[PDB]
């Protein structure tokens, strides 16, 4: 009865500087790998003396996907700033926290996805992994968009492929 | 490993 | 990286069954479309598959099933209508980068009446 | 909603060409493909938010700018007949959904 977890967050500073982003991962509730954009060479960094017998191409690859969620983040603050009619002056976080729990045989037992707003839950994925429960208004727009584009296949691509299957090559390790 | 990058809000 | 539709022009007799066929070569499974263009116009979209039941089905009476084993994204029809005649685009996108639609050289179909 | 211009061009080799795409949809993903026989569509530049540019598969003897969210100019400085194609503009916000323009038709001569 295993479970991963990210939690990708980027906090928007004022003035002409680039948000604040971080991406921490974790095995069984403990952090085994973290990204900050604040360090000197951005990169994935193993939290855990297991995670380090990864090759080179694993964290290159890893930092690179990191770096397209620095854009993800940037541009999403944004869009929230404008379905909030809120003063561009503001600092703001946006989070993401997604992963899945894999029982004893294996198994995707549950999928997550879910969006944060300043603190406040945005929007999330129901546990039937097809459905969005919606906060507010602004989240019931992105909750129509994601309805058209079928953002919850999208997502269970991930949930049912790569999640289980690296959870399982970071349990080997352990 | 991280996931590909969400849609758009 | 590649994506391949076999037969650059096909011709159909209206109210026959109609198969397009597209064959790609990605590492990991990528995102499935099939695109339709009619003369003078942009492309539109017409299925995708991104995960799960592989057999995408459209409203227009088309399906597009994604065979794993096969590296398939074939199209399909029962019964074309006469207005069904145009170029027709399989189209995928790798995992990493979603947003980076490559395409296939297209099939043209023509629905002889 | 996306909308191209000029739809027709002719110019001559060494020509400053600027095609113009213009979308009132949310879209943050923007993109410029040709289209030749035999060949398909073929990206040459995209585009993810304002100011951010990124390389197609394509992208020698092109430029591009996105100045706003909406707008997306396909730059080309010295004109060569290769270039002589048909142009389409799109716009996205989902992984693979794109939503075309209508086309811009240009002609390079020597």
């Known amino acids: 009865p295993h479970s991963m977890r990210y939690y990708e967050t980027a906090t928007s500073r004022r003035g002409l500087g680039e948000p604040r982003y971080t991406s921490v991962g974790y095995v069984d509730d403990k952090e085994f790998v973290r990204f900050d954009s604040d360090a000197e060479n951005p990169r994935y960094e193993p939290q855990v003396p297991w995670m380090e017998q990864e090759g080179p191409e694993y964290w290159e690859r890893i930092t690179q996907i990191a770096k397209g969620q620095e854009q993800w983040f940037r541009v999403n603050l944004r869009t929230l700033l404008g379905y909030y009619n809120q003063s561009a002056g503001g600092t703001h976080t946006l989070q993401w926290m997604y992963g899945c729990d894999v029982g004893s045989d294996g198994r995707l037992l549950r999928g997550y996805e879910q969006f944060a707003y300043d603190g406040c839950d945005y929007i999330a994925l129901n546990e039937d992994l097809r459905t969005w429960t919606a906060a507010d208004m602004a989240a019931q727009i992105t909750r129509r968009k994601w309805e058209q584009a079928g953002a919850a296949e999208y997502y269970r691509a991930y949930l049912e492929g790569e999640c289980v299957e690296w959870l399982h090559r970071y349990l080997k390790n352990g | 490993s991280p996931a590909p990058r969400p849609l758009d809000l | 990286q590649s994506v391949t539709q076999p037969d650059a022009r096909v011709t159909v007799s209206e109210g026959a069954s109609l198969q397009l066929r597209c064959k790609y070569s990605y590492s990991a499974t990528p995102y499935l479309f099939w695109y339709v263009q009619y003369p003078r116009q942009g492309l539109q979209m017409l299925l995708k598959?991104?995960?799960?039941?592989?057999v995408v089905q459209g409203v227009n009476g088309f399906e597009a099933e994604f065979s794993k084993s096969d590296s398939s994204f074939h199209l399909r029809k029962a019964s074309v209508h006469w207005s069904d005649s145009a170029v027709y685009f399989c189209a995928v996108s790798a995992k990493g980068t979603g947003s980076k639609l490559s395409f296939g050289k297209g099939a043209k179909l023509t629905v002889s009446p | 909603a996306v909308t191209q211009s000029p739809r027709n061009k002719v110019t001559v080799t060494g020509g400053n060409v600027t095609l113009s795409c213009r979308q009132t949809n949310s879209h943050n993903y923007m993109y410029w493909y040709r289209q030749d026989t035999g060949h398909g569509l073929r990206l040459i530049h995209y585009?993810?938010?304002?100011?951010?540019?990124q390389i197609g598969d394509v992208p020698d003897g092109y430029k591009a700018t996105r100045t706003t969210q909406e707008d997306f100019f396909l730059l080309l400085e010295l004109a060569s007949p290769s270039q002589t194609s048909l142009y389409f503009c799109?716009?996205?916000?989902?992984?693979?959904?794109?939503?075309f323009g209508e086309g811009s038709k240009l002609t390079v001569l020597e």
């Open positions: 598959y991104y995960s799960g039941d592989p």
């Open positions: 799109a716009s996205s916000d989902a992984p693979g959904q794109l939503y």
């Open positions: 585009s993810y938010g304002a100011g951010n540019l």
